[PDB]
Amino acid sequence: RQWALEDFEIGRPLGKGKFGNVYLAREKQSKFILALKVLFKAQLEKAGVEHQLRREVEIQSHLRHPNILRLYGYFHDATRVYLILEYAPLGTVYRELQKLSKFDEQRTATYITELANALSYCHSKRVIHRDIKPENLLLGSAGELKIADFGWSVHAPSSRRDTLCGTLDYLPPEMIEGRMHDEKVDLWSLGVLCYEFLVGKPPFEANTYQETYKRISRVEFTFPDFVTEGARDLISRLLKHNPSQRPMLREVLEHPWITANSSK
Numbered sequence: 001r002q003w004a005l006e007d008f009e010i011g012r013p014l015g016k017g018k019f020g021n022v023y024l025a026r027e028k029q030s031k032f033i034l035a036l037k038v039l040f041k042a043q044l045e046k047a048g049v050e051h052q053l054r055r056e057v058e059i060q061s062h063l064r065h066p067n068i069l070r071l072y073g074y075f076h077d078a079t080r081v082y083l084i085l086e087y088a089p090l091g092t093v094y095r096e097l098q099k100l101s102k103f104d105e106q107r108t109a110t111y112i113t114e115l116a117n118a119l120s121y122c123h124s125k126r127v128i129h130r131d132i133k134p135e136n137l138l139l140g141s142a143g144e145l146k147i148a149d150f151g152w153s154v155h156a157p158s159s160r161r162d163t164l165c166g167t168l169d170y171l172p173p174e175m176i177e178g179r180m181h182d183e184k185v186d187l188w189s190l191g192v193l194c195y196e197f198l199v200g201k202p203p204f205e206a207n208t209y210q211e212t213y214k215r216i217s218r219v220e221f222t223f224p225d226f227v228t229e230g231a232r233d234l235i236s237r238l239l240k241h242n243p244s245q246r247p248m249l250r251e252v253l254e255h256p257w258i259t260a261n262s263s264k
């Protein structure tokens with residue numbers, strides 16, 4: 001009816017964010033495993049986000065997709081807000097990407113279809129701008145890809161390197177430039193993901209925030225040799241200063257290179 005903390009057993013922290021942690025967890029009776037997002041709400045006050053969080057769990061509770069991480073429920077005690085989340089066993093595509101250093105065209109094209117389907121679902125539900133950079137993407141039961149998004153950025157301990165430092169790389173020129181953004185932002189993201197999948201780094205990566213901005217806004221990015229032309233064409237068509245010049249989502253799914261190497 002309404003949950004509370006003691007309905008759950010708590011395991012390790014999966015990741016730690018600035019507003020709180022995602023703990024591995026299971027409902028007490030069913031012994032069923034899930035993820036508990038814990039938000040401190042004191043850091044929520046300062047940061048000035050409560051309200052929109054509170055209609056978030058409204059909007060996200062309504063969403064259902066294979067490739068979207070499902071929000072089971074939510075509750076609060078006094079000092080903390082809890083998101084009851086679908087558990088994704090295999091973690092972040094960002095770790096996986098760190099493993100192999102790069103993906104191949106199967107992996108990529110399939111992830112991309114998986115992503116395109118979610119966003120396309122998302123739009124129909126009137127939900128835009130989902131942050132799909134790799135560290136908010138999780139890996140489900142066997143191979144499947146899940147957009148986590150929602151709550152604010154969580155890291156499993158690792159690396160350090162790029163902390164962020166990972167920010168604008170995925171941000172579209174219109175967003176960076178402080179301008180009204182529409183559904184088409186998410187296709188910019190897609191273009192950046194795809195590139196990173198194959199290359200191992202994002203196209204605009206640079207040692208300074210300024211320079212990164214320089215490259216994004218001016219859309220300056222160059223492929224290493226191995227990138228297939230069909231890859232290039234999709235990326236190129238995906239990353240355009242003009243939103244209107246970028247494909248609709250099904251165009252992506254229909255793309256020659258997508259359909260070729262996509263397991264899905």
Ligand SMILES: O=C(O)c1ccc(Nc2nccc(Nc3ccccc3Cl)n2)cc1
Nearest residue numbers: 014015022035086087088089091148154156
């Ligand atoms: O540490 C690992 O190997 C690891 C990280 C995440 C895992 N699964 C999972 N499921 C549901 C939500 C969620 N939040 C989250 C946790 C850390 C980073 C990013 C996100 Cl979205 N994470 C499993 C293992």
